[PDB]
Symmetry: D2
Subunit: 115 residues, 4 copies
């Protein structure tokens, strides 16, 4: 129920091998690690979680943009891109978090569907 897609606005390509870490806010207000992975050759990261495990909560999707750009030999501006949202509060939904990256800018959008 959660997929992350990342594109590169400089190359006109998927952003491959981007590390993504997902956190969930705990009862004590700290960010607990929830799932992590890397984008594939298509710029997509599938299989982060399951419908059982992806319960209601406040989630943070951290896209490690600095690590991506530095691995390409570029010095970018941001440390990462964070996307923070409440999920599943009216029941289970499927979420796609999409991001488009440039060295000094990024855009993110969500596509939320009811299966």
């Amino acid at each position: 129920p959660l997929m992350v897609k990342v594109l590169d606005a400089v190359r006109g390509s998927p952003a491959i091998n981007v590390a993504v870490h997902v956190f969930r806010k705990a009862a004590d207000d700290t960010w607990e690690p929830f799932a992590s992975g890397k984008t594939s050759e298509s710029g997509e990261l599938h299989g982060l979680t399951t419908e059982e495990e992806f319960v209601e909560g406040i989630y943070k999707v951290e896209i490690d943009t600095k690590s991506y750009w530095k691995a390409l030999g570029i010095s970018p501006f941001h440390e990462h891109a964070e996307v923070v949202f409440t999920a599943n509060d009216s029941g289970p939904r499927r979420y796609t978090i999409a991001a488009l990256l440039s060295p000094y800018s990024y855009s993110t959008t969500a596509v939320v569907t009811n299966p």
Copy 2:
């Protein structure tokens, strides 16, 4: 009543000395030259027109993004960026057309205020 602002998402800077052409749609559906200039050191192009001249109608703002990228030694995707909109007297009176450029992407927004 019309200002154009252009930013560069690669370098994190204004996009300086970018050519911008404005056209007005004529009765026969052709695009007639209306105003033009180059962005300043702040990425902004002021003074394109006046209230008297900027009547309701369809306008197109063409931003020469290809020359901009090539002067920086970068191969870009688009021939230019285009922004086509209707000026409407029932809305606010000042229009800022902003664009944010990357080699393979651009975004544009309108900020319309009184």
Copy 3:
């Protein structure tokens, strides 16, 4: 070799039933109609052209954003979103033109791959 995808930033959804018209610059510098179609329920428009037909040239992809928003009962700013680019000039490539729409703003990106 040419696909168009459109998303809606207000709804967090694919932009369904968006009309798209593609033009190709002719020898006399006019825009000749090349292909057209509508986005599906996924926000994707497939099947615009063929590798035989999609020769080198300067193409314009016009995404009819005003018609989309008006069909939803909203008064938007732009008439359409245009994407103008040279295609296939180093041989055949596959192009995805993606757009993200809001009533007063849009973003577009290209993903260009070599098959």
Copy 4:
């Protein structure tokens, strides 16, 4: 040396009276409050800090987008927008953090100049 500008892509306007909090990363990796304010009628928040106070380091700019949308009667997706970056004295001296808001999307860019 730091200004924050917020725009609304739905209404085509500055995003006015949006709360913005700036934090500096402390030695123990916690986020310490640094400066805050609300955007003006132009969507801009000036005067957050001074050159003396704005030393190199990692900063986070948190924009309260959820309250902004709810005050307009619109249900938004994000809890807030975050922008996390390093201030570097080897680059230009003035930073503008700009954000463009939609209910289910946002974009941000840095404009860094001397």
